[PDB]
Amino acid sequence: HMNITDIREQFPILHQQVNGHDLVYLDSAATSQKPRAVIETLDKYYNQYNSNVHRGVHTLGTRATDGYEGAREKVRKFINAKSMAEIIFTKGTTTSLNMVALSYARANLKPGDEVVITYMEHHANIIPWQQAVKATGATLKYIPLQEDGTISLEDVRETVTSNTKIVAVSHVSNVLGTVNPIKEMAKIAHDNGAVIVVDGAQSTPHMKIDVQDLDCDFFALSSHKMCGPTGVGVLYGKKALLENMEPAEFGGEMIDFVGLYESTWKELPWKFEAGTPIIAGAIGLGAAIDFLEEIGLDEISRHEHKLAAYALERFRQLDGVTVYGPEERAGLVTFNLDDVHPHDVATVLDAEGIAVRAGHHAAQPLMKWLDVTATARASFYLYNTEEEIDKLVEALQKTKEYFTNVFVDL
Amino acid sequence: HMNITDIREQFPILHQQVNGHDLVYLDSAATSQKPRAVIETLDKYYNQYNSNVHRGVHTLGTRATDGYEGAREKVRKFINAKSMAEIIFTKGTTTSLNMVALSYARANLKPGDEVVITYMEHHANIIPWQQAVKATGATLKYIPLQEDGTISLEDVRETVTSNTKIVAVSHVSNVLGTVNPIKEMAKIAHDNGAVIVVDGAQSTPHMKIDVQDLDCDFFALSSHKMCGPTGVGVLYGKKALLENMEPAEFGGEMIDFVGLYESTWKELPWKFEAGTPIIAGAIGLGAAIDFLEEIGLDEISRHEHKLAAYALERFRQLDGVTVYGPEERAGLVTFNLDDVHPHDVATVLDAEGIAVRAGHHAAQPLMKWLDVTATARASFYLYNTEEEIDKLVEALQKTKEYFTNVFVDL
Numbered sequence: 001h002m003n004i005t006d007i008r009e010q011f012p013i014l015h016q017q018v019n020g021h022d023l024v025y026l027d028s029a030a031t032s033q034k035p036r037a038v039i040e041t042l043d044k045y046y047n048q049y050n051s052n053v054h055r056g057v058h059t060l061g062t063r064a065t066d067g068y069e070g071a072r073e074k075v076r077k078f079i080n081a082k083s084m085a086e087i088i089f090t091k092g093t094t095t096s097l098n099m100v101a102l103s104y105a106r107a108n109l110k111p112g113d114e115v116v117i118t119y120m121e122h123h124a125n126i127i128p129w130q131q132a133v134k135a136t137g138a139t140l141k142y143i144p145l146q147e148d149g150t151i152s153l154e155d156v157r158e159t160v161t162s163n164t165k166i167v168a169v170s171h172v173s174n175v176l177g178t179v180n181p182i183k184e185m186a187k188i189a190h191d192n193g194a195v196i197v198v199d200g201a202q203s204t205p206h207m208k209i210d211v212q213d214l215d216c217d218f219f220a221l222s223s224h225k226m227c228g229p230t231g232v233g234v235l236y237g238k239k240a241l242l243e244n245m246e247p248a249e250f251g252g253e254m255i256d257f258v259g260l261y262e263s264t265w266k267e268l269p270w271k272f273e274a275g276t277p278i279i280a281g282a283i284g285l286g287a288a289i290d291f292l293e294e295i296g297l298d299e300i301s302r303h304e305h306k307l308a309a310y311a312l313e314r315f316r317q318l319d320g321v322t323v324y325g326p327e328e329r330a331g332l333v334t335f336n337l338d339d340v341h342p343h344d345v346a347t348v349l350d351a352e353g354i355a356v357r358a359g360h361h362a363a364q365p366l367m368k369w370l371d372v373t374a375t376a377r378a379s380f381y382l383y384n385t386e387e388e389i390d391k392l393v394e395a396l397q398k399t400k401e402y403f404t405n406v407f408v409d410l
Numbered sequence: 411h412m413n414i415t416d417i418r419e420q421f422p423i424l425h426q427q428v429n430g431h432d433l434v435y436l437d438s439a440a441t442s443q444k445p446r447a448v449i450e451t452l453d454k455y456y457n458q459y460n461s462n463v464h465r466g467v468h469t470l471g472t473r474a475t476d477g478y479e480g481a482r483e484k485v486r487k488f489i490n491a492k493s494m495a496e497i498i499f500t501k502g503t504t505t506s507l508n509m510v511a512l513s514y515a516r517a518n519l520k521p522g523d524e525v526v527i528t529y530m531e532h533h534a535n536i537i538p539w540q541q542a543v544k545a546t547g548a549t550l551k552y553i554p555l556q557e558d559g560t561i562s563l564e565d566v567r568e569t570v571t572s573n574t575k576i577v578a579v580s581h582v583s584n585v586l587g588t589v590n591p592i593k594e595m596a597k598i599a600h601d602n603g604a605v606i607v608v609d610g611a612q613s614t615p616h617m618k619i620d621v622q623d624l625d626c627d628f629f630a631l632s633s634h635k636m637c638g639p640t641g642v643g644v645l646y647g648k649k650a651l652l653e654n655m656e657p658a659e660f661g662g663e664m665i666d667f668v669g670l671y672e673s674t675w676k677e678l679p680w681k682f683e684a685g686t687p688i689i690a691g692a693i694g695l696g697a698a699i700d701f702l703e704e705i706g707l708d709e710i711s712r713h714e715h716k717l718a719a720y721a722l723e724r725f726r727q728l729d730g731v732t733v734y735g736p737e738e739r740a741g742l743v744t745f746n747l748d749d750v751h752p753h754d755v756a757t758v759l760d761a762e763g764i765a766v767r768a769g770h771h772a773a774q775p776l777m778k779w780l781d782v783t784a785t786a787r788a789s790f791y792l793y794n795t796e797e798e799i800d801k802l803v804e805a806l807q808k809t810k811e812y813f814t815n816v817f818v819d820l
């Protein structure tokens with residue numbers, strides 16, 4: 001069982017004050033904090049074995065190469081891919097989904113073809129598809145949501161047709177906390193002749209991923225959300241689909257032969273990795289995976305289930321607070337106070353040391369569906385505790401009273 | 411005047427042995443090493459103020475944002491751009507040139523249009539243009555080289571015509587060491603109605619860049635070659651051209667309004683930065699710039715001029731060694747030993763602690779022009795010394811004798 005004191009002692013950034021109060025960081029769905037094992041991995045790389053990779057002519061070059069391809073294997077095992085050929089390092093989930101939209105969608109869509117998404121998607125899993133359908137004359141459709149912000153498989157079956165070529169959907173929503181029924185959606189897509197593209201940015205850090213159980217055709221994730229460095233992500237795709245897609249970017253490292261006018265590509269996965277790679281970041285993301293595997297993804301999901309059930313109960317104790325989304329959920333709560341703008345809520349909470357986010361959370365169509373212009377969101381990870389949730393609910397109570405008193409005075 | 415002892419004391423990786431001999435790192439044209447100021451900048455970011463950027467709702471978020479946009483200003487000043495709107499953070503020179511090829515070239519080329527490159531280009535400044543001309547039915551042309559591997563402006567004037575829309579050329583070649591006459595080539599391109607795209611990956615680390623003196627329309631560079639983190643680069647473009655180009659990637663952060671089917675973009679530079687950015691890396695590249703500015707780019711270029719004139723003299727002392735390229739050059743020497751394969755040269759030198767590279771150096775058309783299948787390359791930076799060049803030339807002498815003796819025995 002995970003001990004939260006020992007886990008928090010590994011994260012130097014948690015041990016500081018903001019505005020004279022201990023920091024209470026509740027914004028890991030925007031980005032997560034890093035343990036010493038990850039930061040010291042980057043230090044050891046730049047202090048001891050930095051060099052360019054995939055020459056293997058000299059000793060430090062060999063070490064850097066082994067570190068970078070070593071991390072590719074750690075990612076393969078971490079999401080249970082069959083092969084390192086299916087693991088592409090990218091700059092982040094957004095670039096991974098764009099590569100699918102450019103190299104897969106723009107090459108396989110025709111007038112009459114549909115791409116199906118959902119109203120709860122993050123912009124990273126919306127805009128690339130808007131652009132690919134515009135480029136190809138294909139059509140974009142939205143699976144509707146149920147009233148608690150879940151998706152019914154009957155709506156999926158209704159929306160997806162035999163003209164659908166791509167269904168793209170979030171594993172977990174970073175606003176509603178909904179965990180979507182990806183494995184059954186993948187069956188529905190494949191029954192209709194479509195591939196499924198899964199936006200895993202908010203699932204991967206928080207629960208075990210098995211791409212062979214999900215049967216997703218593509219899956220995208222970001223290191224910065226899962227205790228790893230910024231600037232790095234992964235695109236997984238089934239090897240038979242990657243083999244037939246052309247590269248999204250062109251350059252050194254992803255070529256085999258270059259003539260004056262024509263070139264041939266390397267095999268996977270290097271066909272999709274043009275230029276000097278994100279060497280230190282990918283090695284640090286391998287360290288993040290080792291760190292999270294040592295704790296156990298199931299343990300971290302059990303902890304977050306506890307925190308989310310505690311938070312939802314304690315929010316129901318507050319009068320005049322609306323929480324969006326379903327009762328069964330990932331480790332976050334997006335909410336509004338009646339009559340206080342969420343930006344003011346986040347400002348007041350930061351004065352008490354508490355970091356949360358306010359805004360649209362890069363889900364404008366979802367805010368429109370929720371009929372609000374903005375919300376506040378507290379999000380949790382393996383270093384948070386029930387005490388910090390008490391601080392949050394106590395501060396929202398004081399926020400409520402403070403604005404009430406301001407109103408009364410005015 | 412720069413003191414090399416004090417500079418080398420700042421780079422922890424130099425102080426180690428390989429194969430029982432002090433390391434002699436002569437492969438900075440593949441990637442450079444980092445000073446403590448840069449590594450400690452990344453540590454301080456992840457230890458103290460990591461958070462997502464461009465919310466400014468909570469205190470650490472504000473600090474991370476200020477750090478990231480602060481580094482954008484350091485880059486603007488470092489290359490003398492007029493505006494931060496012209497400074498886009500990317501993953502590296504290769505991605506920066508691809509963005510030009512996708513968003514500029516593919517949008518502005520028609521049958522009959524030409525893109526002009528040179529035989530000495532790196533693949534990053536070849537393959538994207540091969541693909542953009544293929545996509546548009548335009549034509550690719552090559553400026554020829556003079557016999558010493560320089561470019562004559564008369565050949566430029568011959569090759570560039572009023573059908574040319576893009577001239578793309580390296581500032582400095584990572585194989586020949588040639589510094590190309592970019593400012594005069596930009597005049598020739600603009601006289602013909604073309605833009606010029608400059609591959610600055612090998613110039614920026616080593617000499618001062620002034621984009622307003624060069625008058626280049628686009629300029630690309632990589633952090634990992636200039637003492638900064640891996641995984642980050644810059645695309646500079648003249649603001650009036652960026653304003654008319656569409657984004658190359660789509661997602662959160664680069665939008666203003668998102669509807670179900672249509673979206674509008676943010677202003678520059680954020681229009682070109684989709685998804686959570688490379689926050690720590692860009693802050694570390696700002697630290698690299700501060701480090702190099704404190705030493706002085708002109709001082710670092712004077713040091714490398716010394717090292718290159720010393721190396722070329724000492725290589726001319728070796729019998730049976732061919733050096734490629736011109737006498738006036740950047741800080742590198744690419745060479746072959748007669749009758750020893752360059753891979754064997756690099757292997758033997760690594761056994762004496764000396765790191766150099768062998769291969770095509772991502773310039774296959776140039777190797778074909780040189781009539782060789784591969785070369786060896788020693789490349790220098792602000793932490794190298796004449797003593798290390800003596801070690802290199804002494805080891806190449808011993809390599810020569812060793813293979814001679816092997817031949818004799820056989």
Ligand SMILES: Cc1ncc(COP(=O)(O)O)c(CN)c1O
Pocket residue numbers: 252274275276277439440502503504505532534535580582583584609611612632634
């Ligand atoms: C002249 C030149 N151009 C382009 C590149 C590609 O830069 P990156 O690998 O950082 O994308 C390099 C890297 N060696 C280079 O030296």
Ligand SMILES: Cc1ncc(COP(=O)(O)O)c(CN)c1O
Pocket residue numbers: 029030092093094095122124125170172173174199201202222224662684685686687
């Ligand atoms: C569900 C979801 N999808 C996609 C993204 C985009 O990931 P990145 O900003 O790392 O590219 C995020 C980031 N918050 C997300 O939470």
